Amino acid sequence: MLQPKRTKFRKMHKGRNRGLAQGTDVSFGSFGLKAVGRGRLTARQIEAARRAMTRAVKRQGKIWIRVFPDKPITEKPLAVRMGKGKGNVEYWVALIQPGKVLYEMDGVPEELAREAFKLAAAKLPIKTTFVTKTVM
Amino acid sequence: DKKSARIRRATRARRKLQELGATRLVVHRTPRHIYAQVIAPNGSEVLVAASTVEKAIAEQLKYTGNKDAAAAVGKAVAERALEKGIKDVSFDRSGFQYHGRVQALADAAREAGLQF
Amino acid sequence: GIREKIKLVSSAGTGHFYTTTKNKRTKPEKLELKKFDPVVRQHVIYKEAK
Amino acid sequence: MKKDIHPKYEEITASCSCGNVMKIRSTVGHDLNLDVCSKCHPFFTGKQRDVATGGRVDRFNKRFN
Amino acid sequence: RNGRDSEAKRLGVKRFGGESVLAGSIIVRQRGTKFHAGANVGCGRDHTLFAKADGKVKFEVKGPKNRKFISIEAE
Amino acid sequence: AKLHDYYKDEVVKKLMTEFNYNSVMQVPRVEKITLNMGVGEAIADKKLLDNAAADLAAISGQKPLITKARKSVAGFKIRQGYPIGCKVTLRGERMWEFFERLITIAVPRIRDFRGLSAKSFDGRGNYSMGVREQIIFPEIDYDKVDRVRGLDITITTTAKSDEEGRALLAAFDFPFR
RNA sequence: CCGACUUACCAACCCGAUGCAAACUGCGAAUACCGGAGAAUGUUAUCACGGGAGACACACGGCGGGUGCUAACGUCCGUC
RNA sequence: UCCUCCUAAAGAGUAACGGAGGAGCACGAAGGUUGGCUAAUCCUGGUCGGACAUCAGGAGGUUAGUGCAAUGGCAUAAGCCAGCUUGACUGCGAGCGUGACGGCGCGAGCAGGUGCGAAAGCAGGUCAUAGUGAUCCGGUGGUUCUGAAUGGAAGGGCCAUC
RNA sequence: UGCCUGGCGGCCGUAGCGCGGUGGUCCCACCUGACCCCAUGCCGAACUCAGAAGUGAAACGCCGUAGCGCCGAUGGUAGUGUGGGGUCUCCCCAUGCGAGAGUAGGGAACUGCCAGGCAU
RNA sequence: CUUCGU
RNA sequence: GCCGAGGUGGUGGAAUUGGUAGACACGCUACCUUGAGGUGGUAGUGCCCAAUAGGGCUUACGGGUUCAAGUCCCGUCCUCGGUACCA
RNA sequence: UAGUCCGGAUUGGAGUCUGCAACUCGACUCCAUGAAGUCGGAAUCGCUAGUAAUCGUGGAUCAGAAUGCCACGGUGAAUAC
């Protein structure tokens, strides 16, 4: 999984996922999987999509993960009442806005990139799209 | 280095004289010369200046960079200040130590009638 | 609270004292401390006392 | 310099063994005698004298004929 | 473990710019020196900026360090 | 003193003739000499520092400063503000006296002096050399042997680079193996 | 003791290209709030002093949020 | 119970068994004032000495320091060193801020007496915000203010204080 | 009136670094010596005093250069007060305000009083 | 105190 | 699940007022006594490097405070003791 | 009365001699170097008189190579209730 080594505080507020993305353009690779819809990805979904995409392209070329979790999501145990403090940190999500290039890759042709990106996008909760690297 | 260090030693008391609204007697010391100005409480105009680089003060002295040149400029700046009439001024030693030539000019203005 | 609580009494015109605090550990000396006495209306020497 | 804290600094005449004399200001309190000086030292003149750095074949031609 | 907080100290700018202040009246209660003292404005031991003359409050940005000052027009 | 005059004539002439110098204030002049004695053993004993103080007061002319610690280090068992060394700054006629005694009557006596290092120039012309024994100076009685207690001497020069400072030093027939 | 010859490797500081932050800010609104001036409006709507109170278990809806599972006709605030 | 930050929605305020940390002190110098100075961390050179002690120079500019948690501040330094000192002074106090109130806080200036400084000035504690408890009852000291016929006194009061 | 220089400011990076060239009659800086005032927690380095032989080396001032720092539009976008709407843990519409970043570009400051030297 | 099997 | 206590050499156990630990007693190693073991007596000993004086690493694991952490703050792992009630 | 003019290990250089041959691995010489060691823990050995202790010499083996072994003399005790 992906998780920040020594984050500053262990628990953090919920907040909202409002607004659009920042990593809009395909910058490191030639092909990218871009988020169409809003949501948040746990580190398990990110690593599962990475494994499926890597098995698909058989470890040729390079694959960039353009998003890090860095947001602890806490969750209370079972059969516990409300109150008594904030719950223990159980996983780490990444807040994903529309227009966010989640993944990038290069070194592979466009057809195997297309099949790999379907095989990776099947693991994520959000709707995605395939985008190509543009100039300007 | 030697110039920038003296500026902050002055800048402590220059700001206080700016707050109090005092008419400043600003001395300047150099190994060759000495200079004295009386600057108005705002700080944008001066009232009277006297120095050793004036010919009228320099021609009467042995050397323009000693204690006696300081005393002559102090006497001249007190006499010229009372030629205008500026009776109560406040002394600004401008970051120099007081005792050397700044004390000669200050003693000369104090003895010739410039009340600080 | 290990800093003990002392009074210091005027040498003359003794109808006034000041009160303060003093560490008995590091400074076991007297506290002379010339202060103002509003009965004599002058500044006099003062003296430590319990 | 401050007055009494410094030790006394008297001008003495130290005498080298090879024949040089040298008036210095020092604090030893007396006159002083030397052996080696800036002149007449094995390094300062040019007699530095590294050893043979291998006299082996010269030793063989000296020993054996 | 948590649940300890203090009581708020009611800081902030009390007399905004263009207001009319009597002498002694408090202009800014603050912690550091966010606003410095200018003409006819005193700084307390609290770093509280108060009025030393009657007039209009003015905020300015003076100094080489681009820092703020509070002055008073003696009106 | 004498080496000051030897500078002002011969070394100024030489350094005009070997570097192109536009001015006589372009020449490297030697600013100060600092004699540091980093005793370090004052973490427990106190009088050994007061003996090294008299050592630098004898070797040099004037009384030393006692240098305290700048930061505390737990590796060395020193604390913030413990008097861990001693030092002497000497400049003017006193550094010219000390420099003439160093170059003439002390530096042969370093007990197999095979020639000190010329690579010890730090980068801005300042030279630094460390003597291991304070008995090389003639100020020591040798009936009053205390400890080995060497020091380090740093000649600080107004040269810009290594080669200008080395020209200034070797102009004084400095040893330089 | 010098020390050289190379790699399945982990990699600081810098440099450029990417993101993230309630407890980060070299930037920074809209609103809100304070003060000054002007016309119209509103049965003085404002302030102070005095007689009498009640009330101090709130609920839901929008908007900004904490907690919860961005669960609850949940819980706790701000504002209407 | 008190202090700092966030929640807190750019005035103030604002809850929860919300998220994080601290205080129940210290200091006659660590206070006042005058004069002076300016960091951390790297690189290089150098006796022991070494990653890290002291020295010198350059880089760098406040990444340091503040008696103590955090925030705000700080170079005119509020940070660092030295001389002389006791303003850590008495009676007040215009006008404000802040609380339902008890209260708490800031304060120019005025009168007396000082300390530093050549002087203008500065000082009625400390860079600021924590370091604390009301009243009763009683203890010590000073003051003819009262003092149960009268003169005293005891006891009350008032002031300082525990 | 025109250059240079010095003192105090106004303004606070379009103003500051960098790189290069330049100034010495004055002014300034370095400098010479420290009998004396004063000075170093050692040290005439600094502070200070008595002096002008030397130099413009360093520092500073001035000119030049965009490698940076810096300023920076028009348009757009994000946000948002108010009134509506939905496919409502987010958005949209009518209207009002409208950034931050970036881009074109600007850019090696401007200036008030006083005093000195110079040339008109 | 003990002193491996035949 | 909550509270309290403890995790220290090969072992049992001490140092919890922040000043570079293992006191004690076993064990083990070398020597001695013994025909030879056992007991007994002497000198050792936490583990890496140099041949020394030394130097480094050492308190379950991770990180912070502090000039310095076994000691303080904190997270997780484990072992003990108490508790886990009223329908 | 000092690790010292004690001690003489270790090491460098220069040699000699025997021997076909001296590196592994001989003995000695000369110069330089100058280590541990200041009477030795628990324990344990030899000795009753020309003995213990101490000082030298000689021989066998042997081309060369004894601090061992075997012999020989010089000085020469203490104690046994």
Curated annotation (Swiss-Prot), chain A:
Changes after translation: Is hydroxylated on Arg-81 by RoxA. The modification is nearly suppressed when E.coli is grown in anoxia.
N-methylmethionine: residues bearing it: M1
Modification sites for (3R)-3-hydroxyarginine: R81
Protein name according to UniProt: Large ribosomal subunit protein uL16
Species this protein is from: Escherichia coli (strain K12)
MF terms in GO: rRNA binding; structural constituent of ribosome; tRNA binding
Gene3D superfamilies: Ribosomal protein L10e/L16 (3.90.1170.10)
GO CC list: cytoplasm; cytosolic large ribosomal subunit
InterPro entries in UniProt: Ribosomal_uL16, Ribosomal_uL16_bact-type, Ribosomal_uL16_CS, Ribosomal_uL16_dom, Ribosomal_uL16_sf
Organismal lineage: Bacteria, Pseudomonadati, Pseudomonadota, Gammaproteobacteria, Enterobacterales
Pfam families linked: Ribosomal_L16
GO biological process: cytoplasmic translation; ribosomal large subunit assembly
PANTHER family, sorted: 50S/60S RIBOSOMAL PROTEIN L16, LARGE RIBOSOMAL SUBUNIT PROTEIN UL16M
Family membership noted in the UniProt record: Belongs to the universal ribosomal protein uL16 family.
Keyword terms: Hydroxylation, Methylation, Ribonucleoprotein, Ribosomal protein, RNA-binding, rRNA-binding, tRNA-binding
Subunit-level organization: Part of the 50S ribosomal subunit. Cross-links to the A and P site tRNAs. Interacts with assembly factor DarP(YjgA).
Entry function: Binds directly to 23S ribosomal RNA and is located at the A site of the peptidyltransferase center. It contacts the A and P site tRNAs. One of the last ribosomal proteins to be assembled in the 50S subunit. The simultaneous presence of uL16 and bL36 probably triggers ObgE's GTPase activity and eventual dissociation from the mature 50S ribosmal subunit. It has an essential role in subunit assembly.
